[PDB]
RNA sequence: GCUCGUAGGUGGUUUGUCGCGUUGUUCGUGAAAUCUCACGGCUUAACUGUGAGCGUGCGGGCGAUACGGGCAGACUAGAGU
RNA sequence: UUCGGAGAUACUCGAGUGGCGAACGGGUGAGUAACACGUGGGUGAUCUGCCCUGCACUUCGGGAUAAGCCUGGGAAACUGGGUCUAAUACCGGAUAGGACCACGGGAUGCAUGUCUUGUGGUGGAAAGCGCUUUAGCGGUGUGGGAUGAGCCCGCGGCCUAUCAGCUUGUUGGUGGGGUGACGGCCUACCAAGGCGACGACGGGUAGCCGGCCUGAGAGGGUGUCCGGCCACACUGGGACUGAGAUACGGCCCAGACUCCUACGGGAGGCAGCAGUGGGGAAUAUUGCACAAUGGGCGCAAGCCUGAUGCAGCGACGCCGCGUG
């Protein structure tokens, strides 16, 4: 199917991540259909921004996020907005 | 290796598909003989039976829906031209 | 690496004194070697070579690193010589020397190497560290009251303090108002010959 | 509670390539051969070079002679080598 | 060695039109990384992240007609009789 | 209860049937001068499992066999028979429009036409399992998305004329066949064309690109790490299963090679990671972990992952710092 995943594009010990919409039959650092965010697990808690309307578009059209990406969507409130749940912001 | 299971299931599937396709081929040749005779009487239901068999094969997944439709159209037009 | 050799020989070859201080002069002429008294041919390559030598041994920079500093300077907008001087001047050990905390350049380098300073509360021990505009430089609070650092606590009057950095009271701290302009700050050399050397 | 089939999404139909050229051959049973010329700057020297092509076009009703500047529209592979269809014979030969 | 001539290349003055060349603008595309400029983070740097460039191009729409070209004419200075 | 054996009812589970996966990921660059690649288009000529979403339905039956048990053959690799039992395995029906044929309407155009509708005549599925009680998983037909893929075309990027004539399914048409799809893709017949000095046909070399090196630039050289596409998997050919196959760790045949054999017959494929011999001027450890990300199956916990994340070794390179 279509996944929203994390691609490691940092250096040897600083795992920077981009939140990419990619087909499942693709290598981890392959050509993404669309990058819609980034995730840095090294800042004060961490650094997280999602587009929040392209994310909604992909979730509505049928992309299935992986489990860390689901965690980020729950943090940012986009997943709650998409499904129809009370807390639309939880950072 | 444990692809031996796939090896066996592939053989079973091959046998089933071969049987089905052979049955459709015999139905089609029978209809072709009927149309070549041109009596227009028995062909009128041999067409129905053959088209039903083609649809059944397509639903079983031995052939593709487009192939079934192609053959059905060809046979129906062959009947109409006689 | 580092040179770690007689500085007077290196000044005598280039016909210019680069050290000053207690060992300011060797009290003798400039035959830098056995044949040092010869009146020798003066090529055009020699002037550029020795000017770049003066630039390197004023700061104790190595050829490979100076080369990179050259691409930075020529690649920077503006001019070239003043940018090269600004880059070579913003080095943290040079800042330590110019802020009147050092007898020479080598010992300022050693004080920076042995980690006697913090910039934004960050322990640094690389001499080639580049200071910036609005940088504060603070001595490690657990490193003061040491003899070679407190000998410069009272001798802060003779050598002038340039007009881009600033020192403060007994807590010896440095503030950088803006990046320097070495062309108007103490050039013992012409920067227009390094550029010509790096074109052949 | 689109309670039946959802219609479509709107789309713009793609445009095929239309070109104008001179008929070269016709003795080919419902096929016409048209010569197309184009000019394009030289990659290095900058001069404008003129080159000619030869496409093969379709005539369900074969009426086109030598000369006969014609208009063509490229289509699906109607044959092994035919990809063009005759549109209209404008300014028929003298 | 010299000439004639095939394809090709190039072409006098002037009117109108087309807008192929040419040129203006806008939309799409020109993946990411690499490269350049500015920051941001590893004690500095190499390295790394972000933003803008670049991506010379190609396709679609809408303008211009000086020059080249096409199409329809005119002229006698070149060419010929 | 034997006092060393019993009892599928029972969590749990070796072997087995069934589903899904195994076509991704990983390697190499031999072949290939080609729509292989790059860039821009077309597909009214096409397909697309799982995922999203709208609308419908989930209805009756039936016969077997794997496994088990008893046997036969064989040196093995394997294999024959008789009984015996299921399923979301298989088969046959009922109803179900995006199947088909014929006749019509309404929209649009880019010639085939396309889209949407009406009538008549033919047809085409499904599968149940679980539940500490709103555990939960499912199944089939279709309209529409997203995704991936196929096919066609314009333009672009080597050397060679001491290679000048190439072509007969060849070029085109008609009727059939075939395909998911147009098409000489195939066939019967008919016509006599098609390509070529703007280099056909032939020979040499070569994976292509984003890029890398150099250069003031234009250019020149190059395609190694990384990323995209292509090709291949001992050599050559072929198909099957499937949504999807160059089918690296699948099948069949032929060939070379290595091995087993009771001589009748069998087995294998590091251009996966690590490693060995050889060649060479020259290039590494039979390392650790699924902790993170991606991937497959499962309701999930989970299980698998030499992808990957790191470590070891080599100044092999760039950068930085010391020997005051
Ligand atoms: Mg299985
Ligand atoms: Mg038979
Ligand atoms: Mg047909
Ligand atoms: Mg070094
Ligand atoms: Mg035809
Ligand atoms: Mg001429
Ligand atoms: Mg002429
Ligand atoms: Mg002309
Ligand atoms: Mg003119
Ligand atoms: Mg880019
Ligand atoms: Mg910094
Ligand atoms: Mg434009
Ligand atoms: Mg005259
Ligand atoms: Mg088991
Ligand atoms: Mg399942
Ligand atoms: Mg599968
Ligand atoms: Mg593979
Ligand atoms: Mg190759
Ligand atoms: Mg192309
Ligand atoms: Mg049995
Ligand atoms: Mg029915
Ligand atoms: Mg049934
Ligand atoms: Mg023939
Ligand atoms: Mg035909
Ligand atoms: Mg090769
Ligand atoms: Mg040059
Ligand atoms: Mg091969
Ligand atoms: Mg081998
Ligand atoms: Mg083979
Ligand atoms: Mg499948
Ligand atoms: Mg199949
Ligand atoms: Mg094969
Ligand atoms: Mg192999
Ligand atoms: Mg293998
Ligand atoms: Mg396999
Ligand atoms: Mg290996
Ligand atoms: Mg050797
Ligand atoms: Mg050797
Ligand atoms: Mg893991
Ligand atoms: Mg995982
Ligand atoms: Mg060495």
Q: Which 3-state string (H, E, C) describes B7-45?
A: HHHHHHHHHHHHHHHHHHHHHHHHHHHHHHHCCCCCHHH
Q: Which residue has the tokens 């912001």?
A: A89
Element (H, E) at C147: helix C147-150
- Of D38, D16, D39, D33, residue with least CA distance to D68: D33
Give A25's contacts (C-beta < 8 A, 6+ positions apart): none
Find out whether C148 and C131 touch, Cβ atoms under 8 Å.
no
A15 touches strand F (CB under 7 A): yes
Q: What subunits make at least 3 CB pairs under 8 angstroms with D?
A: none
Count of residues making up chain D:
94
Residues 118-147/C with CB within 7 Å of nucleic chain F are 126-128
CA/C1' separation B20–F80 (Å): 28
Q: Which pair of tokens denotes residue B71?
A: 């053959």
Ligand approaching nearest to the C-alpha of B21: 2
Give C84's contacts (C-beta < 8 A, 6+ positions apart): C55, C69, C70, C73, C191, C194, C195
Q: How close is the Cα of D57 to the center of ligand 6, in Å?
A: 30
Instruction: Tell me how the structure was determined.
Output: cryo-EM
Q: Measured in Å, how far apart are chain D's first and last C-alpha atoms?
A: 68
Q: How close is the Cα of C11 to the center of ligand 5, in Å?
A: 94
Q: How close is the Cα of C200 to the center of ligand 9, in Å?
A: 52
Give B76's contacts (C-beta < 8 A, 6+ positions apart): B47, B51
Cβ-count burial C4-29 (b if 16+ within 10 Å, e if not): eeebbebbbbbeebbbeeeeeeeeee
Count of residues making up chain A:
91
Find out whether D93 and D65 touch, Cβ atoms under 8 Å.
yes
The greatest distance separating any two alpha carbons of chain B, rounded to the nearest whole angstrom, comes to: 59
D71 — phi, psi (to 5°)?
Answer: -110, 140
C124 touches strand E (CB under 7 A): yes
- Scanning every strand, the nucleotide with its C1' closest to C124's CA turns out to be E43
Instruction: Return d(Cα D5, Cα C196) in angstroms, integer.
Output: 78
The number of beta carbons lying within 10 Å of the beta carbon of residue C52 is 20
- Scanning every strand, the nucleotide with its C1' closest to C129's CA turns out to be E44
Distances (CA, A) of D91 to A15, A90, D32, D67, D70: 69, 73, 17, 10, 8
Task: Name C173's bridge partners.
Answer: C138
Instruction: Return d(Cα B35, Cα C52) in angstroms, integer.
Output: 101
Map residue B66 onto helix, strand or coil.
helix
Q: Cα C46 vs. chain centroid, distance in angstroms? A: 22
Q: Which residue has the tokens 């529209």?
A: D73
- Of C117, C112, C114, C116, residue with least CA distance to C128: C112
Instruction: Return d(Cα A17, Cα A70) in angstroms, integer.
Output: 15
Q: How close is the Cα of B10 to the center of ligand 17, in Å?
A: 20
Instruction: Return d(Cα B67, Cα B80) in angstroms, integer.
Output: 20
Instruction: Return d(Cα D13, Cα C66) in angstroms, integer.
Output: 62
CA/C1' separation C131–F161 (Å): 69
- Scanning every strand, the nucleotide with its C1' closest to C127's CA turns out to be E44
CA/C1' separation D62–F190 (Å): 17
Angle at A19 between CA A15 and CA A22, to 5 degrees: 115
Cβ-count burial A43-55 (b if 16+ within 10 Å, e if not): eeeeebebeeeeb
Task: Name D25's bridge partners.
Answer: D33
Instruction: Return d(Cα B76, Cα C8) in angstroms, integer.
Output: 109
Q: Cα A17 vs. chain centroid, distance in angstroms? A: 9
| Beta strand spans in A9-46 (E) | 17-23, 34-40
Torsion over CA: B52, B58, B64, B65 (sign): positive
Q: Which residue has the tokens 């603070």?
A: C138
Q: Which nucleotides of F are covered by protein (CB under 7 A)?
A: 16-19, 21-22, 24-26, 41-47, 49-52, 54-56, 90-93, 97-102, 110-112, 115, 117, 121-125, 142-148, 151-157, 171-174, 176-185, 190-196, 198, 219, 226-229, 240-243, 247, 249-251, 292-296, 307-311, 319-324
D41 touches strand E (CB under 7 A): yes
Q: Which pair of tokens denotes residue C34?
A: 């056995």
Map residue C6 onto helix, strand or coil.
coil
Give A87's contacts (C-beta < 8 A, 6+ positions apart): A77, A80
Strands A17-23 and A2-8: antiparallel
Helix B4-37 / helix B43-60 crossing angle, nearest 10 deg: 160
Distances (CA, A) of B70 to B53, B74, B82, C22, D39: 14, 6, 19, 104, 46
What resolution in angstroms does the PDB record give? 2.7
Find out whether C11 and C21 touch, Cβ atoms under 8 Å.
no
Q: Hey, what's the torsion of the CAs at D33, D39, D40, D45, to 10 degrees?
A: 120
- Of C199, C195, C197, residue with least CA distance to C84: C195
Map residue D34 onto helix, strand or coil.
strand
CA/C1' separation B19–F67 (Å): 27
Map residue C136 onto helix, strand or coil.
strand
The greatest distance separating any two alpha carbons of chain C, rounded to the nearest whole angstrom, comes to: 55
CA/C1' separation D87–F187 (Å): 32
A23 — phi, psi (to 5°)?
Answer: -75, 145
Distances (CA, A) of C64 to C3, C69, C100, C195, C200: 14, 9, 29, 16, 16
CA/C1' separation C156–F321 (Å): 30
A13 touches strand E (CB under 7 A): no
Torsion over CA: C105, C110, C116, C121 (sign): positive
Distances (CA, A) of C44 to C50, C51, C99, C168, D78: 10, 11, 36, 46, 77
Angle at B52 between CA B77 and CA B31, to 5 degrees: 50
Give A54's contacts (C-beta < 8 A, 6+ positions apart): A34, A36
Instruction: Return d(Cα B19, Cα C22) in angstroms, integer.
Output: 107
- Of C66, C69, C131, C122, residue with least CA distance to C96: C131
- Of C113, C110, C133, residue with least CA distance to C123: C113
């Amino acid at each position: 199917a279509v996944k929203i995943k994390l691609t490691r594009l940092g250096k040897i010990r600083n795992p920077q991540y981009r939140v990419a919409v990619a087909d499942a039959r693709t290598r981890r650092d392959g050509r993404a259909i669309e990058v819609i965010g980034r995730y840095h697990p090294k800042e004060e808690p961490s650094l997280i921004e999602i587009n929040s309307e392209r994310a909604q578009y992909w979730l509505s059209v049928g992309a299935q996020p992986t489990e860390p990406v689901l965690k980020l969507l729950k943090i940012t409130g986009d997943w709650q907005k998409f499904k129809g749940l009370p807390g639309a912001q939880g950072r | 290796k444990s692809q031996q299971k796939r090896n066996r299931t592939n053989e079973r599937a091959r046998l089933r598909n071969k049987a089905v396709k052979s049955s459709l081929r015999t139905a089609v040749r029978a209809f072709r003989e009927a149309a070549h005779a041109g009596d227009k009487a028995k062909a009128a239901e041999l067409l129905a039976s053959t088209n039903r068999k083609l649809d059944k094969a397509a639903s079983k997944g031995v052939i593709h829906k487009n192939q079934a439709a192609n053959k059905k159209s060809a046979l129906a037009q062959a009947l109409n031209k006689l | 690496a580092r040179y770690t050799g007689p500085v007077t020989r290196k000044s005598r070859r280039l016909r210019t004194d680069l050290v000053g201080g207690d060992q300011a002069f060797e009290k003798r002429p400039y035959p830098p070697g056995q044949h040092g008294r010869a009146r020798i041919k003066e090529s055009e390559y020699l002037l550029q070579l020795q000017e770049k030598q003066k630039a390197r041994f004023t700061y104790g920079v190595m050829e490979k690193q100076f080369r990179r500093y050259y691409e930075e300077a020529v690649r920077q907008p503006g001019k070239t010589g003043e940018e090269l001087l600004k880059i070579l001047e913003s080095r943290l050990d040079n800042v330590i020397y110019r802020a009147g905390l050092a007898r020479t350049r080598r010992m300022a380098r050693q004080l920076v190497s042995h980690g006697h300073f913090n910039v934004n509360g960050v322990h640094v021990n690389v001499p080639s560290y580049r200071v910036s505009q609005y940088d504060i430089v603070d001595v490690r609070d657990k490193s003061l009251n040491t003899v070679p650092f407190q000998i410069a606590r009272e001798t802060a009057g003779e050598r002038p303090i340039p007009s881009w950095l600033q020192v403060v009271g007994e807590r010896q701290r440095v503030l950088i108002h803006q990046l320097p302009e070495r062309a108007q700050i103490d050039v013992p050399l012409t920067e227009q010959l390094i550029v010509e050397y790096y074109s052949k | 509670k689109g309670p039946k089939h959802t219609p479509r999404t709107p789309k713009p139909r793609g445009r095929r390539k239309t070109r104008i050229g001179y008929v070269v051959s016709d003795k080919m049973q419902k096929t016409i051969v048209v010569e197309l010329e184009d000019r394009m700057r030289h990659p290095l020297y900058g001069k404008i070079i003129r080159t000619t092509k030869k496409v093969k076009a379709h005539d369900e009703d074969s009426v086109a002679g030598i000369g006969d500047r014609v208009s063509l529209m490229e289509t699906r592979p109607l044959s092994a080598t035919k990809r063009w269809r005759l549109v209209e014979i404008l300014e028929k030969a003298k």
